[PDB]
Protein backbone atom coordinates (compact mmCIF):
# COMPACT_ATOMS: atom_id res chain seq x y z
CA UNK A 1 0.00 0.00 0.00
CA UNK A 2 0.99 3.63 -0.55
CA UNK A 3 -0.23 7.12 -1.43
CA UNK A 4 -3.24 7.14 0.89
CA UNK A 5 -2.94 10.91 1.24
CA UNK A 6 -3.00 11.24 -2.55
CA UNK A 7 -6.11 9.06 -2.61
CA UNK A 8 -7.87 11.29 -0.06
CA UNK A 9 -6.90 14.31 -2.15
CA UNK A 10 -8.29 12.63 -5.27
CA UNK A 11 -11.59 12.04 -3.50
CA UNK A 12 -11.65 15.69 -2.45
CA UNK A 13 -11.04 16.92 -5.98
CA UNK A 14 -13.72 14.52 -7.23
CA UNK A 15 -16.34 15.90 -4.85
CA UNK A 16 -15.37 19.49 -5.67
CA UNK A 17 -17.99 20.70 -8.19
CA UNK A 18 -15.60 22.90 -10.19
CA UNK A 19 -13.76 19.69 -11.04
CA UNK A 20 -17.07 18.42 -12.43
CA UNK A 21 -17.05 21.21 -15.02
CA UNK A 22 -13.36 20.59 -15.69
CA UNK A 23 -14.10 16.90 -16.34
CA UNK A 24 -17.08 17.82 -18.51
CA UNK A 25 -14.73 19.89 -20.66
CA UNK A 26 -12.07 17.16 -20.70
CA UNK A 27 -14.62 14.57 -21.86
CA UNK A 28 -14.95 16.40 -25.18
CA UNK A 29 -13.83 13.98 -27.87
CA UNK A 30 -13.38 10.96 -25.61
CA UNK A 31 -14.58 7.36 -25.52
CA UNK A 32 -15.74 5.02 -22.79
CA UNK A 33 -13.10 2.51 -23.88
CA UNK A 34 -10.41 5.17 -23.43
CA UNK A 35 -11.72 6.15 -19.99
CA UNK A 36 -11.86 2.53 -18.86
CA UNK A 37 -8.38 1.79 -20.18
CA UNK A 38 -6.99 4.86 -18.43
CA UNK A 39 -8.52 3.87 -15.09
CA UNK A 40 -7.31 0.28 -15.44
CA UNK A 41 -3.83 1.54 -16.33
CA UNK A 42 -3.78 3.79 -13.27
CA UNK A 43 -4.72 0.90 -10.99
CA UNK A 44 -2.11 -1.33 -12.63
CA UNK A 45 0.51 1.38 -12.20
CA UNK A 46 -0.24 1.54 -8.48
CA UNK A 47 -0.02 -2.22 -8.01
CA UNK A 48 3.14 -2.42 -10.15
CA UNK A 49 4.78 0.32 -8.08
CA UNK A 50 4.02 -1.79 -5.02
CA UNK A 51 5.33 -5.02 -6.54
CA UNK A 52 8.56 -3.37 -7.70
CA UNK A 53 9.38 -1.15 -4.72
CA UNK A 54 8.56 -3.71 -2.03
CA UNK A 55 11.69 -5.60 -3.10
CA UNK A 56 14.12 -2.91 -1.92
CA UNK A 57 12.22 -0.16 -0.07
CA UNK A 58 10.43 0.04 3.28
CA UNK A 59 7.70 2.49 4.20
CA UNK A 60 7.30 4.21 7.56
CA UNK A 61 4.58 1.67 8.43
CA UNK A 62 6.77 -1.38 7.80
CA UNK A 63 6.16 -4.08 10.39
CA UNK A 64 6.79 -7.81 10.86
CA UNK A 65 3.48 -8.42 9.03
CA UNK A 66 4.29 -6.08 6.14
CA UNK A 67 1.53 -4.76 3.91
CA UNK A 68 -0.90 -7.29 5.36
CA UNK A 69 -1.49 -4.96 8.29
CA UNK A 70 -2.03 -1.94 6.05
CA UNK A 71 -4.53 -3.91 3.98
CA UNK A 72 -6.34 -5.13 7.09
CA UNK A 73 -6.46 -1.54 8.29
CA UNK A 74 -7.94 -0.39 5.00
CA UNK A 75 -10.56 -3.13 5.29
CA UNK A 76 -11.38 -2.29 8.91
CA UNK A 77 -11.70 1.41 8.10
CA UNK A 78 -14.04 0.63 5.21
CA UNK A 79 -16.05 -1.64 7.49
CA UNK A 80 -16.45 0.83 10.35
CA UNK A 81 -17.12 3.76 8.00
CA UNK A 82 -19.66 2.19 5.61
CA UNK A 83 -21.00 -1.15 6.83
CA UNK A 84 -21.49 -0.22 10.49
CA UNK A 85 -23.18 3.01 9.39
CA UNK A 86 -25.55 0.99 7.22
CA UNK A 87 -26.10 -1.34 10.19
CA UNK A 88 -27.04 1.62 12.39
CA UNK A 89 -29.54 2.82 9.80
CA UNK A 90 -31.00 -0.68 9.40
CA UNK A 91 -31.25 -1.04 13.18
CA UNK A 92 -33.24 2.17 13.50
CA UNK A 93 -35.42 1.11 10.57
CA UNK A 94 -36.18 -2.28 12.12
CA UNK A 95 -36.82 -0.73 15.53
CA UNK A 96 -39.33 1.68 14.00
CA UNK A 97 -41.05 -0.98 11.88
CA UNK A 98 -41.18 -4.05 14.15
CA UNK A 99 -39.31 -3.24 17.35
CA UNK A 100 -35.76 -4.09 18.34
CA UNK A 101 -35.01 -7.63 17.21
CA UNK A 102 -38.08 -7.78 14.99
CA UNK A 103 -36.24 -9.47 12.12
CA UNK A 104 -35.35 -12.43 14.38
CA UNK A 105 -38.84 -13.06 15.77
CA UNK A 106 -40.24 -16.55 15.67
CA UNK A 107 -43.13 -17.32 13.31
CA UNK A 108 -46.62 -16.82 14.67
CA UNK A 109 -47.61 -20.00 16.55
CA UNK A 110 -50.25 -22.22 15.02
CA UNK B 1 -55.84 -6.72 -3.19
CA UNK B 2 -56.27 -10.08 -1.48
CA UNK B 3 -54.60 -12.35 -4.03
CA UNK B 4 -52.32 -9.67 -5.47
CA UNK B 5 -50.09 -8.88 -2.48
CA UNK B 6 -47.79 -11.89 -2.96
CA UNK B 7 -47.16 -10.79 -6.56
CA UNK B 8 -45.17 -7.63 -5.74
CA UNK B 9 -41.68 -9.03 -6.32
CA UNK B 10 -38.25 -7.51 -5.81
CA UNK B 11 -35.06 -8.96 -7.21
CA UNK B 12 -32.05 -10.10 -5.25
CA UNK B 13 -28.94 -7.94 -5.00
CA UNK B 14 -25.90 -10.25 -4.92
CA UNK B 15 -22.97 -9.61 -7.26
CA UNK B 16 -20.76 -12.60 -8.10
CA UNK B 17 -17.45 -10.87 -8.80
CA UNK B 18 -14.11 -11.35 -7.08
CA UNK B 19 -10.70 -10.59 -8.63
CA UNK B 20 -8.58 -13.73 -9.00
CA UNK B 21 -4.90 -12.74 -8.63
CA UNK B 22 -2.91 -15.90 -9.31
CA UNK B 23 0.41 -14.10 -9.76
CA UNK B 24 0.46 -13.90 -5.96
CA UNK B 25 0.34 -17.69 -5.54
CA UNK B 26 2.86 -20.34 -6.56
CA UNK B 27 1.49 -23.44 -4.80
CA UNK B 28 -1.50 -25.62 -5.53
CA UNK B 29 -4.48 -25.75 -3.19
CA UNK B 30 -6.63 -28.68 -2.06
CA UNK B 31 -9.94 -29.31 -3.78
CA UNK B 32 -13.07 -31.21 -2.80
CA UNK B 33 -14.66 -34.18 -4.52
CA UNK B 34 -18.38 -33.56 -4.89
CA UNK B 35 -19.67 -36.73 -6.56
CA UNK B 36 -18.41 -40.28 -7.09
CA UNK B 37 -16.96 -41.10 -10.49
CA UNK B 38 -19.64 -43.22 -12.14
CA UNK B 39 -17.81 -43.25 -15.49
CA UNK B 40 -15.43 -45.93 -14.16
CA UNK B 41 -16.48 -49.18 -12.47
CA UNK B 42 -20.11 -48.30 -13.13
CA UNK B 43 -21.38 -51.86 -12.78
CA UNK B 44 -19.79 -52.44 -9.35
CA UNK B 45 -20.63 -49.08 -7.74
CA UNK B 46 -23.55 -50.37 -5.60
CA UNK B 47 -21.23 -53.15 -4.42
CA UNK B 48 -18.08 -51.17 -3.56
CA UNK B 49 -19.60 -47.82 -2.56
CA UNK B 50 -19.69 -48.76 1.14
CA UNK B 51 -15.96 -49.49 1.37
CA UNK B 52 -12.99 -47.12 1.69
CA UNK C 1 20.84 21.09 -29.82
CA UNK C 2 19.38 21.53 -26.33
CA UNK C 3 16.48 19.69 -24.72
CA UNK C 4 13.40 21.73 -23.81
CA UNK C 5 10.53 19.23 -23.94
CA UNK C 6 9.27 18.00 -20.57
CA UNK C 7 9.87 14.26 -20.90
CA UNK C 8 7.35 12.14 -18.97
CA UNK C 9 8.49 9.00 -17.19
CA UNK C 10 5.99 6.82 -19.05
CA UNK C 11 8.04 7.26 -22.23
CA UNK C 12 10.98 5.63 -20.41
CA UNK C 13 9.76 3.27 -17.68
CA UNK C 14 6.91 0.99 -18.71
CA UNK C 15 4.96 -0.68 -15.88
CA UNK C 16 4.22 -4.37 -15.94
CA UNK C 17 0.64 -5.57 -16.25
CA UNK C 18 -0.33 -7.21 -12.95
CA UNK C 19 -4.00 -6.29 -12.58
CA UNK C 20 -5.21 -9.28 -14.55
CA UNK C 21 -3.17 -12.45 -14.02
CA UNK C 22 -1.11 -14.18 -16.70
CA UNK C 23 -2.30 -17.07 -18.84
CA UNK C 24 0.70 -19.35 -19.28
CA UNK C 25 -1.46 -21.76 -21.28
CA UNK C 26 -2.35 -19.03 -23.81
CA UNK C 27 -5.83 -20.54 -24.06
CA UNK C 28 -9.22 -19.21 -22.94
CA UNK C 29 -11.06 -20.54 -19.92
CA UNK C 30 -13.92 -22.10 -21.88
CA UNK C 31 -11.40 -23.98 -24.02
CA UNK D 1 20.43 -18.20 -23.34
CA UNK D 2 17.25 -16.14 -23.60
CA UNK D 3 15.57 -14.66 -26.67
CA UNK D 4 16.11 -11.09 -25.47
CA UNK D 5 18.04 -8.96 -27.99
CA UNK D 6 18.82 -5.43 -26.74
CA UNK D 7 17.53 -2.58 -28.85
CA UNK D 8 20.44 -0.84 -30.57
CA UNK D 9 18.76 2.55 -30.17
CA UNK D 10 20.94 4.99 -28.19
CA UNK D 11 18.19 5.49 -25.60
CA UNK D 12 18.76 1.84 -24.64
CA UNK D 13 22.21 0.67 -25.79
CA UNK D 14 24.32 3.81 -25.86
CA UNK D 15 27.18 3.65 -28.37
CA UNK D 16 26.21 0.41 -30.11
CA UNK D 17 27.74 0.92 -33.55
CA UNK D 18 30.01 3.87 -32.83
CA UNK D 19 32.95 1.46 -33.16
CA UNK D 20 33.38 -1.63 -35.35
CA UNK D 21 33.81 -4.07 -32.45
CA UNK D 22 31.93 -5.50 -29.48
CA UNK D 23 33.42 -7.03 -26.34
CA UNK D 24 32.08 -9.45 -23.75
CA UNK D 25 33.16 -11.22 -20.57
CA UNK D 26 32.65 -14.98 -20.51
CA UNK D 27 32.37 -17.43 -17.63
CA UNK D 28 33.29 -17.16 -13.98
CA UNK D 29 36.86 -16.19 -14.88
CA UNK D 30 35.43 -13.47 -17.15
CA UNK D 31 37.59 -14.13 -20.19
CA UNK D 32 37.51 -11.34 -22.75
CA UNK D 33 36.11 -11.95 -26.22
CA UNK D 34 35.87 -9.52 -29.14
CA UNK D 35 33.24 -9.92 -31.86
CA UNK D 36 32.75 -8.01 -35.14
CA UNK D 37 29.79 -5.66 -35.16
CA UNK D 38 28.71 -7.10 -38.52
CA UNK D 39 28.59 -10.62 -37.10
CA UNK D 40 26.42 -9.08 -34.39
CA UNK D 41 24.19 -7.06 -36.73
CA UNK D 42 23.39 -10.31 -38.52
CA UNK D 43 21.03 -10.95 -35.58
CA UNK D 44 18.91 -7.85 -36.12
CA UNK D 45 17.83 -9.22 -39.50
CA UNK D 46 15.97 -12.02 -37.71
CA UNK D 47 14.96 -9.83 -34.79
CA UNK D 48 11.20 -9.24 -34.65
CA UNK D 49 10.05 -5.76 -33.64
CA UNK D 50 6.44 -6.64 -32.80
CA UNK D 51 7.74 -8.22 -29.58
CA UNK D 52 9.32 -6.07 -26.88
CA UNK D 53 10.02 -7.11 -23.29
CA UNK D 54 11.77 -5.99 -20.11
CA UNK D 55 10.68 -2.34 -20.11
CA UNK D 56 10.50 -2.44 -23.92
CA UNK D 57 14.28 -2.54 -24.23
CA UNK D 58 14.63 -6.08 -25.61
CA UNK D 59 13.13 -7.49 -28.79
CA UNK D 60 12.77 -11.18 -29.63
CA UNK D 61 14.26 -13.14 -32.50
CA UNK D 62 12.33 -15.48 -34.75
CA UNK D 63 12.23 -18.96 -33.27
CA UNK D 64 13.86 -20.49 -36.35
CA UNK D 65 17.01 -18.38 -36.06
CA UNK D 66 17.09 -18.46 -32.26
CA UNK D 67 16.93 -22.25 -32.24
CA UNK D 68 19.58 -22.54 -34.95
CA UNK D 69 21.81 -20.44 -32.68
CA UNK D 70 20.97 -22.59 -29.64
CA UNK D 71 21.71 -25.72 -31.67
CA UNK D 72 25.13 -24.46 -32.69
CA UNK D 73 25.89 -23.68 -29.04
CA UNK D 74 24.67 -27.12 -27.94
CA UNK D 75 26.74 -28.86 -30.61
CA UNK D 76 29.88 -27.02 -29.52
CA UNK D 77 29.18 -27.84 -25.88
CA UNK D 78 28.58 -31.55 -26.44
CA UNK D 79 31.68 -31.72 -28.63
CA UNK D 80 33.66 -30.16 -25.79
CA UNK D 81 32.21 -32.73 -23.38
CA UNK D 82 33.00 -35.63 -25.71
CA UNK D 83 36.50 -36.92 -26.47
CA UNK D 84 36.00 -38.41 -29.96
CA UNK D 85 35.15 -34.93 -31.25
CA UNK D 86 36.59 -33.84 -34.57
CA UNK D 87 39.82 -31.86 -34.39
CA UNK D 88 38.38 -29.46 -36.98
CA UNK D 89 35.04 -28.03 -38.10
CA UNK D 90 35.75 -28.73 -41.78
C1 LIG E 1 -8.01 8.30 15.61
C2 LIG E 1 -7.35 6.99 15.18
C3 LIG E 1 -8.42 5.91 15.08
C4 LIG E 1 -9.07 6.02 13.71
C5 LIG E 1 -10.45 5.35 13.68
C6 LIG E 1 -10.38 3.87 14.03
C7 LIG E 1 -9.97 3.11 12.78
C8 LIG E 1 -9.23 1.83 13.16
C9 LIG E 1 -8.66 1.19 11.90
C10 LIG E 1 -7.28 1.78 11.64
C11 LIG E 1 -6.92 1.62 10.16
C12 LIG E 1 -5.78 2.58 9.80
C13 LIG E 1 -5.68 2.71 8.28
C14 LIG E 1 -4.43 1.97 7.82
C15 LIG E 1 -4.25 2.16 6.32
C16 LIG E 1 -2.97 2.95 6.07
C17 LIG E 1 -3.10 4.38 6.57
C18 LIG E 1 -1.73 5.05 6.47
O19 LIG E 1 -0.77 4.48 6.85
O20 LIG E 1 -1.63 6.34 5.93
C21 LIG E 1 -2.37 7.30 6.63
C22 LIG E 1 -1.95 8.70 6.19
C23 LIG E 1 -0.49 8.73 5.77
O24 LIG E 1 -0.41 8.92 4.38
P25 LIG E 1 0.87 8.29 3.57
O26 LIG E 1 0.41 7.69 2.27
O27 LIG E 1 1.54 7.23 4.40
O28 LIG E 1 1.94 9.49 3.26
C29 LIG E 1 2.49 10.15 4.36
C30 LIG E 1 2.87 11.57 3.97
O31 LIG E 1 3.87 11.53 3.00
C32 LIG E 1 3.37 12.31 5.21
O33 LIG E 1 4.67 11.88 5.50
P34 LIG E 1 5.26 12.17 7.01
O35 LIG E 1 6.61 11.52 7.13
O36 LIG E 1 5.37 13.65 7.25
O37 LIG E 1 4.24 11.50 8.12
C38 LIG E 1 3.87 10.17 7.91
C39 LIG E 1 2.67 9.82 8.78
C40 LIG E 1 3.14 9.59 10.21
O41 LIG E 1 2.22 8.80 10.92
C42 LIG E 1 2.74 8.36 12.14
O43 LIG E 1 3.75 7.74 12.16
C44 LIG E 1 2.03 8.69 13.45
C45 LIG E 1 2.87 9.75 14.17
C46 LIG E 1 2.73 9.72 15.70
C47 LIG E 1 3.07 8.36 16.32
C48 LIG E 1 1.98 7.92 17.31
C49 LIG E 1 0.68 7.65 16.55
C50 LIG E 1 -0.52 7.50 17.49
C51 LIG E 1 -0.65 8.65 18.50
C52 LIG E 1 -0.56 10.03 17.86
C53 LIG E 1 -1.51 10.19 16.67
C54 LIG E 1 -2.96 10.23 17.13
C55 LIG E 1 -3.85 9.98 15.92
C56 LIG E 1 -3.93 8.50 15.58
C57 LIG E 1 -3.17 8.22 14.28
C58 LIG E 1 -3.35 6.76 13.90
C59 LIG E 1 -2.40 6.39 12.76
C60 LIG E 1 -1.00 6.13 13.30
O61 LIG E 1 1.77 10.88 8.72
C62 LIG E 1 0.51 10.60 9.24
O63 LIG E 1 -0.04 9.59 8.98
C64 LIG E 1 -0.16 11.62 10.16
C65 LIG E 1 -1.15 10.91 11.07
C66 LIG E 1 -1.31 11.73 12.35
C67 LIG E 1 -2.27 12.88 12.07
C68 LIG E 1 -2.64 13.56 13.39
C69 LIG E 1 -3.91 14.38 13.21
C70 LIG E 1 -4.40 14.84 14.58
C71 LIG E 1 -5.90 15.10 14.54
C72 LIG E 1 -6.61 14.22 15.56
C73 LIG E 1 -6.40 14.76 16.98
C74 LIG E 1 -5.29 14.04 17.74
C75 LIG E 1 -5.60 12.56 17.98
C76 LIG E 1 -6.87 12.40 18.79
C77 LIG E 1 -6.79 11.10 19.58
C78 LIG E 1 -6.92 9.90 18.65
C79 LIG E 1 -6.74 8.63 19.47
C80 LIG E 1 -7.17 7.42 18.65
O81 LIG E 1 -2.11 9.58 7.26
C82 LIG E 1 -3.08 10.57 7.05
O83 LIG E 1 -4.06 10.58 7.72
C84 LIG E 1 -2.87 11.63 5.97
C85 LIG E 1 -3.46 12.95 6.45
C86 LIG E 1 -3.55 13.93 5.28
C87 LIG E 1 -3.96 15.31 5.79
C88 LIG E 1 -5.44 15.29 6.19
C89 LIG E 1 -5.82 16.61 6.86
C90 LIG E 1 -5.49 16.56 8.35
C91 LIG E 1 -6.42 15.61 9.09
C92 LIG E 1 -5.64 14.83 10.15
C93 LIG E 1 -6.25 13.44 10.34
C94 LIG E 1 -5.86 12.54 9.17
C95 LIG E 1 -6.60 11.21 9.28
C96 LIG E 1 -6.06 10.41 10.46
C97 LIG E 1 -7.19 10.11 11.44
C98 LIG E 1 -6.59 9.83 12.82
C99 LIG E 1 -6.64 11.10 13.67
C100 LIG E 1 -8.07 11.38 14.14
Closest CA to D19 of D42, D5, D37, D41: D37
Which is nearest to D35 in space by CA: D50, D52, D51, D23?
Answer: D23
Q: Are D63 and D14 in contact (CB under 8 A)?
A: no
Rounded distance, CA D29 to CA A73, Å? 51
Instruction: Report DSSP state, residue D13.
Output: S
**Ligand 1 atom nearest to A7, measured from its CA:** 26
Contacts of A52 in chain C (CB under 8 A): 16
**DSSP line for D19-37:** SSEEEEEETTTTEEEEEEH
Q: State whether A40 and C19 contact (CB < 8 Å).
A: yes
Please indicate whether, in this complex, the C-beta atoms of B22 and C21 are within 8 angstroms of each other: yes
Contact between B20 and C21 using a beta-carbon 8 Å cutoff:
yes
Residue nearest to atom 37 of ligand 1 (CA): A60
Q: How was this structure determined?
A: cryo-EM
Q: Is A3 in the pocket of ligand 1 (CB under 6 A)?
A: yes
Q: How many angstroms separate the CA atoms of A5 and A9, rounded?
A: 6
∠ CA(A87), CA(A3), CA(A10), 5° rounding? 70
- Please tell me the distance from the alpha carbon of residue B52 to that of residue B8, in angstroms, as a whole number: 51
Distances from the Cα of D59 to the Cα of A6, A43, A105, C13, D6, angstroms? 36, 27, 69, 16, 6
Helix or strand or coil: residue A46? Answer: helix
Q: What is the resolution of this structure in A?
A: 2.8
Q: What contacts B45, CB < 8 A, 6 or more positions away? A: B36, B38
A70's CB contacts (< 8 A; 6+ apart) are: A1, A61
Distance CA D70, CA A56 (A): 35
Q: A19 — contact with chain C (CB < 8 Å)?
A: no
Number of C to D CB contacts under 8 A, please give it. Answer: 3
- Sheet containing D5-6: which strands, arranged edge to edge? D5-6, D58-61, D47-53
CA distance A1 to chain C (A): 15
Distance A16 CA to ligand 1 centre (A): 23
d(CA B51, CA B39): 18
Pairing of strands D31-36, D21-26: antiparallel
Long-range Cβ contacts of A100-103 (<8 Å, 24+ apart): none
Note whether C15 contacts B: Cβ–Cβ < 8 A: no
Tell me whether residue B23 is exposed, middle or buried, using C-beta atoms within 10 angstroms of its C-beta: 0 to 12, 13 to 18, 19 or more: middle
Q: Is the CB of A70 under 6 A from ligand 1?
A: yes
Amino acid sequence: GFHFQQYIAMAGRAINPVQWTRAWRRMEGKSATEVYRDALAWTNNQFAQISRASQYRAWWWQNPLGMGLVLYGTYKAWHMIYMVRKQKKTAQLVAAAYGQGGQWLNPVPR
Amino acid sequence: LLGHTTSVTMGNSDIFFLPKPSNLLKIALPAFVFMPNLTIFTRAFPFYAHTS
Amino acid sequence: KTLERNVPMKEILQPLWVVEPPNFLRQPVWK
Amino acid sequence: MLNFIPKRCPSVSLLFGKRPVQRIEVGQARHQLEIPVETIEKIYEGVDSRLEYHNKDYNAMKWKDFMKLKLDAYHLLEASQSETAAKSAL
